[PDB]
């Protein structure tokens, strides 16, 4: 997260760390949506042009974390994976269209103060909240700046980071980039004119873009951090998987394979 700040503890209890076993590293962000299911971006798990195709045994999910590197004995829970489910129309060849994946945990995690799932939007909520100008929140342990810019050492954060960003009109998203933008993506971030800053960056991808409903006080995950052209550049915006468009796929998978 660029230009974000330290999360308060328990501020984002659906935040999940996708952790590579060997070599040990933060792969991606992710979100807890029930006791047995975690949601993330497909490009975190599958991108053949960089020979990327992670199996279930290659990874661990770590939930309830605040610290990036420490084992937090009294807070975090580590789970193994049973099955990865990638969107079958995930278009890595061109523009990361339908960049969405589900992960079934081998055993159900118990919820706690630090571990609690986010809601998925319905049609009403999506119609209400996904509007240009309205802000959502993005969190993660990705980089604090683009790599090989500014000062190297202070690149990875100590603790989970949070930033709030406004949804941007579709025409500006489209006019901001050469990539083919589809209705399974939306974009967010401040405009050069608006004199505030912030963005997802490398390592935050796959994590949630959340909005709080004023109708019922609940946090809904409206997006998954998908792609960008660098991090936090003027005239550029982060692009997010439109979670509601693909909600039917999420429920189809969970109803079939959720025991």
């Amino acid at each position: 997260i660029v230009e974000g700040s330290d999360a308060e503890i328990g501020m984002s209890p659906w935040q999940v760390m996708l952790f590579r076993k060997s070599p040990q590293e933060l792969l991606c962000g992710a979100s807890l949506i029930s006791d047995r299911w975690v949601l993330t971006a497909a490009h975190c798990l599958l991108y053949p042009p960089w020979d990327k195709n992670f199996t279930e045994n290659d990874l661990l999910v770590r939930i309830g974390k605040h610290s990036r590197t420490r084992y937090e004995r009294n807070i975090e829970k580590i789970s193994m994976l049973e099955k990865i489910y990638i969107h079958p129309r995930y278009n890595w060849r061109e523009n990361l269209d339908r960049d969405i994946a589900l992960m079934k945990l081998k055993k159900p995690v118990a919820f706690s103060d630090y571990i609690h799932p986010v809601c998925l939007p319905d049609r009403e909520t999506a119609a209400s909240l996904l509007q240009a100008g309205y802000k959502g929140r993005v969190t993660g342990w990705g980089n604090l700046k683009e790599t090989w810019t500014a000062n190297v050492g202070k690149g990875q954060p100590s603790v989970l980071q949070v930033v709030n960003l406004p949804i941007v009109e579709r025409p500006v998203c489209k006019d901001s980039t050469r990539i083919r933008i589809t209705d399974n993506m939306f974009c967010a971030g401040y405009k050069p004119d608006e004199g505030k800053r912030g963005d997802a960056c490398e390592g935050d991808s796959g994590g949630p873009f959340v909005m709080k409903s004023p109708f019922n006080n609940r946090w809904y995950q409206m997006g998954i951090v998908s792609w960008g052209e660098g991090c936090d550049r003027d005239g550029k915006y982060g692009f997010y998987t439109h979670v509601f468009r693909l909600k039917k796929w999420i429920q189809k998978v969970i109803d079939q394979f959720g025991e």
């Binding site: 503890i9 501020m11 706690s112 998925l120 100008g133 309205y134 406004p166 609940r218």
Partner: peptide
């Protein structure tokens, strides 16, 4: 069905330091 309500914030009646910013964006513009 209990989703989206944070034990350390909504369940106790406590706001985090910036959620207000979000609600202002829904109302002001």
């Amino acid at each position: 069905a209990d989703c989206g309500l944070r034990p350390l914030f909504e369940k106790k009646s406590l706001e985090d330091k910036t959620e207000r910013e979000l609600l202002e964006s829904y109302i002001d513009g």
